[PDB]
Structures are given as structure tokens and as C-alpha cells.
Structure 1
């Protein structure tokens, strides 16, 4: 199947910025603040003592290499008498994946629409909705702040909902595997919200998520930081103060670390075309593998006879279908030429 000259979708998951608060004892809240401060380190660079080839430069003597290298960073920490930290944002799950946002070819629109209806019927939305929601219900969107913490707690507030807010107390102890989430009192009622949101022409499903981090005394917080003072935080205005925030696009990248179907999978990757790993600077699912999104999107006509048959599909060629569906929930421009 050819790529058209116009093909684009909208995203089906819409997160927001994360706001950081300081809860004091006797329960008053205050927005967390930060300050820039200059520091002074050693002169480690391997470019100040060596050249490009690798022999020692003769200008950097032992006295000139112990001189003092001043830097300037932003610095954010928990105040002294504080109790814990609130972190609050919101997610929507809203059915944009059913038909393309823009598509000049009517044949490609019919083919893309059938796939979503075939996938919904033959495979179902249970596997993807479980994998997105297990990144909300633990501290995956709290990136490094989860690390080096006593405990953290997640409280959900789903909107088309009756009552009794959903709580996930003491992660790192109680919510480790997939089965620990399914043992919650109301887990099948929240998974079937995301399934109803994807399976309907107007599905809505808003969540209000709020966390509670119990850090050590006077400890660090790690917010997101700007693209360009060497470490500059991203910030908004709460009341009249500046306050560090976790970026909206940073938060959506944490909900979508699902991709563990690339051919030698150990660690789940953030969902993308030719899905990259930023730990080791490589692309798993390179176009030479044949298992990027554009080599699977061309096999969309072949995947229709697999799903419209009656034999259960091979697990190997439904991992290609989970990756096809996860890139349409992600959205993007799919043009060419």
C-alpha cells in the first residue's frame, strides 16, 4: 500500500503539565520554588587535558589543571520542615484513532478504518489500555523522583464515574507486577473506561491524577528542563511564584513507554516510528529490520485477511498490530516525497 501525499492523525492521549507542591504539617500547601546558584568544580572534561587524537596537550600543566571551573545551575530541593510533595496533572483518552485527521486518498482511509474495527473485534483494546494505565498508576510520569524516595501514592479521579476515588498506596511494595494492579478493588472499571473511549465515535474518559512523594530530609527534586546557566528548568506561575513543572510532552512520553515488541526486547521503549532508545544512541526497529512503522503500514492490506480469518493470529504478527495501533494513538504526519 502506497503512502498518500496527505496523511495525518491527531493524538488520542492528551496529558498536561505536572505541578509540584509542598505540603506542610498542619496541612497547608505551597508551590515548590527553585533558585539558580553558581558552584565550582574541578576541570574534568577530557578536552582540557587531551587533544582529539589522544596524546596529552602540553599547555595543561599540573598547576593549570587544578584551577577551578565555575558553573551555574538551577537547583530545587524540598524545604526543611516539609511533610511531602503533591504532584497533579490530568489525562484524556479520546477516540481520535478511529479515522484519519487528513487523508486525500479515499482508498487508504477505507483500509485504515477497517483495521481499527478489525483489531477492536479480533484482538481488543484490553492489552493497550492496560499498558497505558500502568504508567499512570505507578510513578512512571514521576521520572527520577520515584528513585530515592520512601514511598509514593497515586490517587485517581476518573470523570464519567460514580464515586470512591481510586487509590494505589505504597508502590515499590504493593504494585510491582501486572497481577498486583488487577487485585485492586476497582481496576476493571477503569480499564473498561479506556476501552469504551477507544471503541466509541465520541469517547471521552478524563482522569485527574495526583501523587504524594515522601522524600528524605532536604532532598532533591528533578523537574524537566529547557532546550537551549547550564541547567535551566521549565516553569510556570502558580499564585505569584515561579515553580518547576514536568512538561506536557515529557509526561506523554512516560505514558507511552510500552514498546517491547522490537526483535530483541528487554526494556520497554517510548512508542515512535523506528523506535529509538536514548540510553544507547541507536534505533531498534531500523528500516533494515523491516519492523518500523512504515514497513508495517504498507502491510495493512495483508493484516486484514489475518484478522478477518478465523484462526487465532500468530503472536508474532499481532505484536506488529499492537505497534501499528500504538502509533495511531500517538498520531503524527505520515506523508512522503
Structure 2
């Protein structure tokens, strides 16, 4: 997997191979460095007004012969017809009129904000930020009101 980023300030970043970068650990040289530079652009954008910033993120995937792809799924009613699909996938209309597979904005978003490893003084894996510390995999909550957290 290769990742490439351009921004409105003229910078460009390139990860030659993203498959090994962990949450916890230390990155290889000429990768750790790009993380520092990107951090600076964003740290500013987040807090100082009157700066226009805009980013364009592309990636490439090397695949198998006929590999299956997993786009976002729609939320639906059960059809009563038996001629209508029970599992329907999300697509986007292209400028030429054809449809293409896509991933929804809020699904990209939920991934980007998965940064909370501040709970219970034991980092584990990070959670999607939520007022109550919701844990979807275990169907529970890590900052239950009863704890004061």
C-alpha cells in the first residue's frame, strides 16, 4: 500500500509502504520525519484562524487476481418483493454519468478520530472519541457515568 498527500501550502508527503506503521512504536527514518512535518501544518490549522488549508489524499492498493472489495453499505428496510437486494452497497455518480463504489464521509471520519487511549490509565487500543466512552466491539461503555470519568 502506498500513500500520497498534497496540500494547499505546496508540501507533498509520501509513504513508500504503509503496511507496517503501528500506533505504538517508532517509525523508520524518512517516515518519522514526515510525520513531524505534517504535524506542524495541522497543529496550526486546528488553532489559528484565517489560514485556508485543504488537503488531497490518494493511495494505491496492489491486489490479487480477482480480489473482493468492501465499500460502504446502505441502511435499508427489508423488501417485501423478493426481487430487490437485501444487501445494497453505496456508489457515487461520476462526472460522466456512470456510478462507482465509494466509502461514505462519516465512515472515513470515524476512522480519523480514533485516538483515545487515555482511559483507565491503560492504553490498550484507542477508542473513537465519545462522551461516554462507547465500545462498539464489546457493546459497552468505558466512561460510564457511575465512574466519574
Smaller-chain TM-score bracket: 0.7 to 0.9
Q: How does 1:105-184 map to 2 (within 5 A)?
A: 152-161=1-10, 163=11, 165-173=12-20, 175-176=21-22, 178-180=25-27, 183-184=30-31
Q: Deviations over 1:42-81 (max 9, x none)?
A: xxxxxxxxxxxxxxxxxxxxxxxxxxxxxxxxxxxxxxxx
Q: CA RMSD for the aligned pairs?
A: 1.9
| 2:146 alignment partner, SS class | coil
1:187, CA displacement in angstroms?
3.1
Number of residue equivalences: 137
1:181, CA displacement in angstroms?
6.6
Do the aligned partners of residues 218 and 212 (structure 1) sit closer, same or farther apart at CA in structure 2, a change above 3 Å counting? same
| 1:267 alignment partner, SS class | coil
Aligned residue among 67, 76, 80 for 1:219: 67
Q: In the alignment, which residue of structure 1 is the partner of 2:133? A: 275
Matched, 1:243 2:100: yes
* Equivalent pair of 1:182/1:188 in contact (CA under 8 Å): no
Q: TM-score, normalised by structure 2?
A: 0.81
5+ residue gaps, structure 1? 1-151, 292-337
Mapped to 2, the partners of 1:230 and 1:166 lie a distance apart of 41
| 1:189 alignment partner, SS class | helix
Q: TM-score, normalised by structure 1?
A: 0.38
5+ residue gaps, structure 2? 77-84
Larger Rg: 1
Do the aligned partners of residues 236 and 182 (structure 1) sit closer, same or farther apart at CA in structure 2, a change above 3 Å counting? same
The structure, 1 or 2, with the larger RCO (C-alpha pairs under 8 Å, 6+ apart) is 1
Aligned residue among 224, 231, 237 for 2:87: 231
Q: Deviations over 1:115-134 (max 9, x none)?
A: xxxxxxxxxxxxxxxxxxxx
Aligned residue among 202, 205, 208 for 2:50: 202
Mapped to 2, the partners of 1:202 and 1:272 lie a distance apart of 29
1:201, CA displacement in angstroms?
2.3
